[PDB]
Design a protein around this motif. Structure first.
Motif, PDB file in Angstrom:
ATOM      1  N   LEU A 198     -70.794 -17.281 -35.447  1.00 30.55           N
ATOM      2  CA  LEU A 198     -70.490 -18.697 -35.569  1.00 30.55           C
ATOM      3  C   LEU A 198     -69.319 -18.901 -36.508  1.00 30.55           C
ATOM      4  N   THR A 199     -68.600 -19.999 -36.267  1.00 33.34           N
ATOM      5  CA  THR A 199     -67.399 -20.382 -36.987  1.00 33.34           C
ATOM      6  C   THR A 199     -67.660 -21.691 -37.700  1.00 33.34           C
ATOM      7  N   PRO A 201     -61.472 -22.395 -40.854  1.00 30.27           N
ATOM      8  CA  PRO A 201     -61.496 -21.425 -39.738  1.00 30.27           C
ATOM      9  C   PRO A 201     -61.912 -20.010 -40.157  1.00 30.27           C
ATOM     10  N   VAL A 202     -63.178 -19.886 -40.560  1.00 29.95           N
ATOM     11  CA  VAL A 202     -63.770 -18.626 -40.938  1.00 29.95           C
ATOM     12  C   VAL A 202     -65.174 -18.569 -40.362  1.00 29.95           C
ATOM     13  N   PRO A 203     -65.774 -17.367 -40.337  1.00 36.69           N
ATOM     14  CA  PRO A 203     -67.148 -17.250 -39.884  1.00 36.69           C
ATOM     15  C   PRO A 203     -68.145 -17.877 -40.860  1.00 36.69           C
ATOM     16  N   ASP A 242     -71.292 -17.586 -43.151  1.00 38.57           N
ATOM     17  CA  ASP A 242     -71.910 -16.541 -43.966  1.00 38.57           C
ATOM     18  C   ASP A 242     -73.429 -16.705 -44.112  1.00 38.57           C
ATOM     19  N   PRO A 290     -61.110 -23.678 -33.292  1.00 40.06           N
ATOM     20  CA  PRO A 290     -61.164 -23.086 -34.609  1.00 40.06           C
ATOM     21  C   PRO A 290     -59.805 -22.990 -35.271  1.00 40.06           C
ATOM     22  N   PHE A 342     -68.140 -18.738 -47.439  1.00 38.01           N
ATOM     23  CA  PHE A 342     -67.401 -18.465 -48.668  1.00 38.01           C
ATOM     24  C   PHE A 342     -65.977 -18.095 -48.284  1.00 38.01           C
ATOM     25  N   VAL A 343     -65.066 -19.055 -48.405  1.00 36.49           N
ATOM     26  CA  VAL A 343     -63.704 -18.889 -47.903  1.00 36.49           C
ATOM     27  C   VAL A 343     -62.795 -18.234 -48.960  1.00 36.49           C
TER      28      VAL A 343
END
Ligand SMILES: CC(=O)N[C@H]1[C@@H](O[C@H]2[C@@H](O)[C@@H](CO)O[C@H](O)[C@@H]2O[C@@H]2O[C@@H](C)[C@@H](O)[C@@H](O)[C@@H]2O)O[C@H](CO)[C@H](O)[C@@H]1O
Ligand SMILES: CC(=O)N[C@H]1[C@@H](O[C@H]2[C@@H](O)[C@@H](CO)O[C@H](O)[C@@H]2O[C@@H]2O[C@@H](C)[C@@H](O)[C@@H](O)[C@@H]2O)O[C@H](CO)[C@H](O)[C@@H]1O
Lengths: 306, 305
Positions: free
Chosen positions: B12-13, B18-20, B22, B55, B212-213
């Protein structure tokens, strides 16, 4: 059970070979040069192939730890993990960790770190970085790539993510070649577990690509990255897992306002599209247009010319 | 029938960056209002706020650089819609779709590719930052100003901003994920906002999909919480299943063992509540995912999570 496509216009689609939107459709003259990309590979019944994974943000990304530096241009040794942070297994039946770039060139972007353990845990840093897929240290199948970064004084042996932004030719004459696979295990080693090459077989047919013009970092390269099917289709097929009834799904590019079909194409079971056309041609199509599944046919179906 | 895509957390995004994803996180109910503008979508598939489908559009900008000013936010970027079409400031949106929905600095890269008469096809890229605190952050009006690393290699040409991460600004403007920026000027109210969300059943709290970007210096944890992930938004947009009630009961299941681990309320306007008290990072098996159970209503009493 019944097969289908997601309903999405070009600007609602993401390139499966680089994390940017689709710009246009393009059909290419058939050449001696082989199409064998490893990202953006998925069967119509939802089997991901090559280095293909599900997330747009995983495409040409790396995740791992920087563990050493060497006295070479590709200075910083990054030991890779799977993109979800799990341990990478080099004996797995893949060409490389999923999301690895599938072309010869330099990918530019940024690296970011976030420390863990004893040394300033939680401290972060980010900067510009490049990954050359020509590098003798580009050995992702073995479990590592080396990075070139802009500031060698602010980079630690800590968890690291590479975020891609664009591509380019290298600056020593190693060109960006979107259809040349890198050596995933380095010099003198051959690639394995590859998604097979794709080509039209039927006479008068050519591959149709979903084309993006990606960012470049200097010079005049057009930044062309062509994918076989867009990421959203791969995601859709993965969810659906509709059994494929034949080797070819006939699909129609429709204008949804007027209801008219603009052209038709063959969507092959292994996840690529052919059209009846001769010559390089950037397609001229309305912005609201999209493909729809028509019916199951076979290899020898004769397409209306496009 | 209504449904959810079948996707684990690592599949999942985040719909706000635009990261997965966590992890999952439930937050203590606070006086602070949750009113994010990205990652907003009804269960019948109506995108809201500044939400778009890609995304790679989240916290991205596209446009032309047209001027520079003698301020830290130096380079004036006149914005287009992310697909390259002309931005219309009178559109019923808070800002161009994909605009950041928090106070902070977004760092990434800018890239240019020239068109017209001046070296058409020439390109360049470099590190750049966008402060959403800036008085020149006026995306609703049609522009933002950029800080870049090399002021000598940047032209008045088509420009894309690619986000990489976020941070506090370096001068008493902290990264605040739940504080909306002023999309127009400093004294102008935001408009066409997706509404605030809050639990209104007692004992209930919001459940977030947490990422957590990346950060670019210091110790910020880079927490960005979204209401629903981008893939769910994409799924609801396709399906447009009519919503039969105000609340879809959903179960977080372990697909191997077949066991339901907890249940939650997925509200029609596109957010999740759970019966729990206190901040809690959920600890759940990696293969787990939500499934749609049934349509219920506001008064449904959730099993404690
Ligand atoms: C190392 C360096 O001198 N960088 C400058 C330089 O960059 C040039 C240069 O690398 C030449 C070498 O063949 O290739 C390009 O021209 C490159 O510039 C880049 O590409 C051109 C077409 C422009 O789009 C340019 O903006 C871009 O940077 O010169 C440029 C100025 O033109 C910069 O000043 C670099 O920092
Ligand atoms: C020399 C220079 O101009 N910048 C350095 C500097 O960057 C620091 C600095 O901006 C301080 C402000 O007092 O804030 C940060 O600490 C920042 O460093 C960044 O954050 C710390 C926690 C580290 O993770 C660091 O690697 C990161 O860059 O110091 C660092 C070195 O410590 C860099 O060398 C910058 O270029």
């Amino acid at each position: 059970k019944p097969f289908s496509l997601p309903i999405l216009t070009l600007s609602e689609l993401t390139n499966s070979r680089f994390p940017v939107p689709i710009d246009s459709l393009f059909t290419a003259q058939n050449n001696v040069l082989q199409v064998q990309c490893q990202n953006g590979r998925c069967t119509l019944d939802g089997e991901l192939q090559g280095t293909t994974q599900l997330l747009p943000s995983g495409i040409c990304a790396f995740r791992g730890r920087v563990t050493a530096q060497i006295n070479q241009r590709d200075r910083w040794h990054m030991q890779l993990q799977n993109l979800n942070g799990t341990t990478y297994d080099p004996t797995d039946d893949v060409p490389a960790p999923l999301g690895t770039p599938d072309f010869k060139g330099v990918v530019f972007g940024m690296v970011s770190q976030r420390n863990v353990g004893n040394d300033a845990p939680g401290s972060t840093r980010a900067q510009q970085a490049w990954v050359s897929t020509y590098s003798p240290q580009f050995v992702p199948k073995l479990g590592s790539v080396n990075l070139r970064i802009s500031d060698n004084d602010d980079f630690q042996f800590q968890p690291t993510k590479f975020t891609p932004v664009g591509v380019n030719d290298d600056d020593d004459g190693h060109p960006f070649r979107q259809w040349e696979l890198p050596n995933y295990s380095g010099e003198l080693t051959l690639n394995m577990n590859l998604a097979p090459p794709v080509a039209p077989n039927f006479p008068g047919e050519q591959l149709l690509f979903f084309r993006s013009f990606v960012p470049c970092s200097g010079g005049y390269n057009q930044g062309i990255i062509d994918c076989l099917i867009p990421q959203e289709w791969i995601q859709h097929f993965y969810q659906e897992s509709a059994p494929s009834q034949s080797d070819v799904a006939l699909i129609r590019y429709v204008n949804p306002d007027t209801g008219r079909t603009l052209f038709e194409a063959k969507l092959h079971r292994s996840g690529y599209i052919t059209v009846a056309h001769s010559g390089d041609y950037p397609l001229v199509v309305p912005a609201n247009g999209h493909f729809r599944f028509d019916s199951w046919v076979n290899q020898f179906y004769s397409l209306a010319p496009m």
